Ligand binder design. Structure first.
Ligand SMILES: [Cl-]
Ligand SMILES: [Zn+2]
Ligand SMILES: [Zn+2]
Ligand SMILES: [Zn+2]
Lengths: 189, 77
């Protein structure tokens, strides 16, 4: 049985997520046509729970739309059909900032809050290819989650008071390993 | 008033108290109240189809101890 190597700010245990070290590069390769057109792209990190640790085994690129500044799913029923019939857990997500720096935006935090409420270990990977930087983030728990849950500020992109998020602990929360990765691109063009 | 279940894709099952007359939007509001997820991020699926906001549980013949499935939208910026 795998053991706990990371904790939330409130002292809650976080099970390890094993991340294929090729995932970041593969994601950039798969979404390169969009990056070239200055369009963001997102993906879902899917996997399994085995003996008290999570394993990311699939990178899923869902049906979606985008601009230079945003990306979003458009057919979650299609995504559900895949995860349900393959019995894969949602463990986090990934997206590109084609021109921007590596950080979690207002949209990113509002989105990630819900994933992290549903799975305390849920992670958000952000790729900033024009900067050759990347990051793996989560909200501060409980304080960051509380702030985002309570937030009703207008504007697609608005700031938040103080620190709401952090880089995840590595390798304690996320450990990058040499492991199998399947790509599943559900897009129709 | 009856119990229904909402199973996530993360190994979590949410238990809700509802009535057959509750609309899907009412259900999403209950999920927000209890779990903190905004309704506009929620997609609910039952017996293979995504449930429309305006319709009721009884419309989809959702009865007691039925399980709905929650898939979140993804929005990035
Ligand atoms: Cl597959
Ligand atoms: Zn906000
Ligand atoms: Zn597979
Ligand atoms: Zn972002």
């Amino acid at each position: 049985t795998f053991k706990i190597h990371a904790y939330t700010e409130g002292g809650k245990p976080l099970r390890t997520i094993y991340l294929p070290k090729l995932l970041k590069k593969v994601f950039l390769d798969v979404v390169k046509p969009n990056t070239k057109k200055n369009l963001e792209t997102c993906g879902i990190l899917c996997g399994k729970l085995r003996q008290n640790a999570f394993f990311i085994t699939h990178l899923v690129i869902p049906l979606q739309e985008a601009t230079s500044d945003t990306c979003g799913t458009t057919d979650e029923a299609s995504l559900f059909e895949f995860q349900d019939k393959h019995n894969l857990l949602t463990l986090g997500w990934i997206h590109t900032h084609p021109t921007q720096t590596c950080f979690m935006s207002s949209v990113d935090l509002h989105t990630h809050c819900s994933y992290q409420l549903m799975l305390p270990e849920a992670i958000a990977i952000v790729m900033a290819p024009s900067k050759n930087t990347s990051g793996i983030f989560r909200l501060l728990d409980p304080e960051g989650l509380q702030t985002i849950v309570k937030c009703r500020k207008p504007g697609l992109f608005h700031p938040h008071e103080g620190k709401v998020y952090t880089m995840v602990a590595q390798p304690g929360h996320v450990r990058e390993i040499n492991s199998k990765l399947q790509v599943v691109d559900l897009r129709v063009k | 008033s009856m119990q229904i279940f909402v199973k996530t894709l993360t190994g979590k099952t949410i238990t809700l108290e509802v009535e057959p007359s509750d609309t899907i939007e009412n259900v999403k509001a209950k999920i927000q109240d209890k779990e903190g997820i905004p309704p506009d991020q929620q997609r609910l699926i039952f017996a293979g189809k995504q449930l429309e906001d305006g319709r009721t549980l009884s419309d989809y013949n959702i009865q007691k101890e039925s399980t709905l499935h929650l898939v979140l939208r993804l929005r990035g910026g």
